Design an enzyme around this catalytic site. Sequence first.
Site, PDB file in Angstrom:
ATOM      1  N   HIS A  91       0.879  -1.181   0.000  1.00  0.00           N
ATOM      2  CA  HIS A  91       0.000   0.000   0.000  1.00  0.00           C
ATOM      3  C   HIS A  91       0.915   1.229   0.000  1.00  0.00           C
ATOM      4  CE1 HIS A  91       1.066  -0.720   4.160  1.00  0.00           C
ATOM      5  NE2 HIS A  91       1.097   0.614   4.244  1.00  0.00           N
ATOM      6  N   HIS A  93       1.192   5.653   1.227  1.00  0.00           N
ATOM      7  CA  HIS A  93       0.752   6.806   1.973  1.00  0.00           C
ATOM      8  C   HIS A  93       1.082   8.025   1.125  1.00  0.00           C
ATOM      9  CE1 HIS A  93       0.513   4.410   5.771  1.00  0.00           C
ATOM     10  NE2 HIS A  93       1.412   3.708   5.112  1.00  0.00           N
ATOM     11  N   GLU A 103       5.824   9.017   5.153  1.00  0.00           N
ATOM     12  CA  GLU A 103       5.834   8.851   6.623  1.00  0.00           C
ATOM     13  C   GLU A 103       7.260   8.963   7.141  1.00  0.00           C
ATOM     14  OE1 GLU A 103       3.423   5.142   7.229  1.00  0.00           O
ATOM     15  OE2 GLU A 103       2.006   6.738   7.784  1.00  0.00           O
ATOM     16  N   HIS A 116       4.862   0.869   0.932  1.00  0.00           N
ATOM     17  CA  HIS A 116       5.197  -0.122   1.962  1.00  0.00           C
ATOM     18  C   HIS A 116       4.787  -1.474   1.460  1.00  0.00           C
ATOM     19  CE1 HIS A 116       4.763   3.151   5.288  1.00  0.00           C
ATOM     20  NE2 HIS A 116       5.949   3.130   4.683  1.00  0.00           N
ATOM     21  N   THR A 195       2.664   1.720  11.295  1.00  0.00           N
ATOM     22  CA  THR A 195       2.403   3.196  11.368  1.00  0.00           C
ATOM     23  C   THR A 195       0.939   3.523  11.421  1.00  0.00           C
ATOM     24  OG1 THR A 195       2.292   3.570   8.974  1.00  0.00           O
ATOM     25  CG2 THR A 195       4.545   3.671  10.019  1.00  0.00           C
TER      26      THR A 195
HETATM   27  N1  LIG Z   1       1.836   1.255   7.365  1.00  0.00           N
HETATM   28  S1  LIG Z   1       2.489  -0.122   7.740  1.00  0.00           S
HETATM   29  O1  LIG Z   1       3.298  -0.670   6.629  1.00  0.00           O
HETATM   30  O2  LIG Z   1       3.101  -0.043   9.017  1.00  0.00           O
HETATM   31  C1  LIG Z   1       1.192  -1.213   7.872  1.00  0.00           C
HETATM   32  N2  LIG Z   1       1.136  -2.455   7.336  1.00  0.00           N
HETATM   33  C2  LIG Z   1      -0.078  -3.009   7.623  1.00  0.00           C
HETATM   34  C3  LIG Z   1      -0.751  -2.101   8.430  1.00  0.00           C
HETATM   35  N3  LIG Z   1       0.035  -0.995   8.585  1.00  0.00           N
HETATM   36 ZN   LIG Z   2       2.113   1.845   5.481  1.00  0.00          ZN
END
Ligand SMILES: NS(=O)(=O)c1ncc[nH]1
Ligand SMILES: [Zn+2]
Length: 257
Positions: A91, A93, A103, A116, A195
């Site tokens: 995904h 951000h 981020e 990510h 995050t």
């Molecule tokens: N944004 S993160 O990559 O830390 C994440 N992955 C799944 C939920 N949040």
């Molecule tokens: Zn993320």
Amino acid sequence: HWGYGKHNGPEHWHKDFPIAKGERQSPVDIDTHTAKYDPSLKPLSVSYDQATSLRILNNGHAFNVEFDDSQDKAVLKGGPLDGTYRLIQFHFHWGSLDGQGSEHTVDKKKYAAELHLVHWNTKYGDFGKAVQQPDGLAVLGIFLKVGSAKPGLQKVVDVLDSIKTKGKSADFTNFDPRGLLPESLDYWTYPGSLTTPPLLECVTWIVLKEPISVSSEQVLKFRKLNFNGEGEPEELMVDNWRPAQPLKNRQIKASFK
Ligand SMILES: NS(=O)(=O)c1ncc[nH]1
Ligand SMILES: [Zn+2]
């Protein structure tokens, strides 16, 4: 419940998720003059030849492109990691404008967006178990800057109009995530967290130094997504990033000199 607005955004999360003020939160600012080159770090191994994408989902916070993680088909190994981590989803951000969106920051610089690729450690058997462990996840973070189009991003941006609102999904088979990588795999790494709530402290972060370039038209299409559900008042899905968190008692290591 939580989101990215004034009333339910990052500054509010601690009330339902007190770990928001913990000792290993992400993201963080990467001070390139404080991160130490660690000549003991290995080259990352990104093994995505057999990746099997399945579906893309607007979850009301971002969109996730989901993979078949029922076998070792797309794995991250090497670098700071011990053992094998299976790709479950990626995904992004991103910002309302190109000057914000990422981020992680680099010497306080914000990039237009951050990708990510989320992987879980197979020694824990499933993702829900892995996120309970300090070495449960490995997230490969890749910065996006706006300039030239990223050819391997365009199949993602062309399906976004079909998953405009929260809860919508679409078939997304045969997508090759190798087309989202930059040329260099040089990286920084540090121990951190998810995050997004629940903010669990289970992530080895691996953030690539080289950003990928995407076009203004590509990132404009991300900003036409919605946080809301179908038929609800429109809330454009922009600024779905958490700001940098205190580094505390952590060291960010560089794989390169
Ligand atoms: N944004 S993160 O990559 O830390 C994440 N992955 C799944 C939920 N949040
Ligand atoms: Zn993320």
